Design a protein around this ligand. Sequence first.
Ligand SMILES: Nc1ncnc2c1ncn2[C@@H]1O[C@H](COP(=O)(O)O)[C@@H](O)[C@H]1O
Ligand SMILES: Nc1ncnc2c1ncn2[C@@H]1O[C@H](COP(=O)(O)O)[C@@H](O)[C@H]1O
Lengths: 277, 277
Amino acid sequence: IPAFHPGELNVYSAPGDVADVSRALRLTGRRVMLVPTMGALHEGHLALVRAAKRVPGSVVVVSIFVNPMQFGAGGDDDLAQLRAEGVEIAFTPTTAAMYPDGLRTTVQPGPLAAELEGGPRPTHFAGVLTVVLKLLQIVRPDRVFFGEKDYQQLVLIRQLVADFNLDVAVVGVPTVREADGLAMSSRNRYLDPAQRAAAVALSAALTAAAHAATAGAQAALDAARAVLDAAPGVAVDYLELRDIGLGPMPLNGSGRLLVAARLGTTRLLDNIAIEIG
Amino acid sequence: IPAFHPGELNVYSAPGDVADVSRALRLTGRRVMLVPTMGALHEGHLALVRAAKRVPGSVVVVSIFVNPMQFGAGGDDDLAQLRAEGVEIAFTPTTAAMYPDGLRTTVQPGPLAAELEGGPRPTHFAGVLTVVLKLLQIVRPDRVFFGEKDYQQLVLIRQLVADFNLDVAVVGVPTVREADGLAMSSRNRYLDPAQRAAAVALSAALTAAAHAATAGAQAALDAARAVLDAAPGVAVDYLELRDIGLGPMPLNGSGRLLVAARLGTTRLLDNIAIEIG
Ligand SMILES: Nc1ncnc2c1ncn2[C@@H]1O[C@H](COP(=O)(O)O)[C@@H](O)[C@H]1O
Ligand SMILES: Nc1ncnc2c1ncn2[C@@H]1O[C@H](COP(=O)(O)O)[C@@H](O)[C@H]1O
């Protein structure tokens, strides 16, 4: 078994090393928490880590991995940040370690993967679910944390876990926002100051919608569309109101409003809870 | 937690019930063994059960489930037999319990699934791997047992376990045969006495090949083909020599010879280890 130093950051890149350390720790009664990321960490990621850390005695495992793009699809102080959060395990595998036999067996999501973010990127969620399934098997966490920021991803992870009978609790963590409401994202770094200012329209549109919703679903959608239309440098890709599981919105109930929009070349996403009437 | 009576047969049909009992038993140090079947049990299945039982203190879980056919694909004393073998858990889920949300997330095998048995049934191994992945997650066995009888299936399960980082040992169990060499199978029950007699040709052809192989790969294939051609009521679907992982056979080394053949309407399979020269 590789060395593990409790109460310090321990970095592993081989799946077998994390699997052995995780198994040994879980046997002592320390619950293991998994927080999957693509690195370039910010306060949105740190909220997931802090939620994992709230679990007494937990070993928090944060993975950093950028899954390769499949055919036809286009597209640092991380460890220091994790250490300062009291994360004990960082898992940083190479592509070759994750895929030693290439892309062979994979996960095929259900049809929700072709909707919304799957429209522009029809293979994206197959990659996500394949990687998350692997991380779950390597780490064997008690709980795994995903942000509401990627709501469709979170819903699909719930489907993965239900459909494959996975014995992990999926924990969704609320979106972390800047003071003006802009959802935090590493992509925000691509925005120039004017685009950053204009980008507040996404959260402004969704929050306006969530309040407009006392007057019903159409009022909510129309309020959001009006705010986005008022922002000249924001080009909307989609703005959709769905039920909480991303099926069709019901006449009366809880739903989710999702937007994707481009500021110049940068595509941003946001979503919010909606209660109808 | 559902009742569990040690040293007796316990039957569960709900995934959650087996998952809770398995988790509780594993915590006591009893290792859990999983033997997946489609019921209609015979001595070939019992060999898998006996191999599982050899593991001291093991709880043997035998699942009985017939996975539904996907679109475009065509096609009792089981519990008493398991009880007499000292099996403590039989898991007998309905289709609805296995697929409460229908066929949604599934496993997509690698390209070996389209070869050999996947030729006639291109969706068959996706169903197999999906079901086995679910059974593995429900039961969380230390080891899972598959017969060499279904060699391509066994190879694909090894791929599933490697590619998804599954923390289970896959145990292949040698094929159980009748006294004359016919590989045991529930399908043998479909054969009339004359067809049963003729069916010995499959094992005769493979065993002849395994001995002919001192003279090389072509000699081995030709010996097998000659035996099959000598049996007038046996129609060969395929006869292929491959490496042990079912890639192309190497010039010198270990391989596997696989045959599929029809006697009237009944399709039978057999395979054997081959050592080249
Ligand atoms: N602003 C945010 N608030 C909450 N979660 C976030 C935020 N940004 C990213 N995440 C979550 O962090 C995880 C890793 O994101 P990524 O590194 O973008 O794969 C995913 O579960 C995201 O949904
Ligand atoms: N004659 C046999 N010898 C060894 N294993 C067998 C035999 N017949 C069936 N099996 C194994 O029993 C398991 C269940 O088979 P089935 O019930 O046909 O799905 C599979 O792993 C088969 O490969």
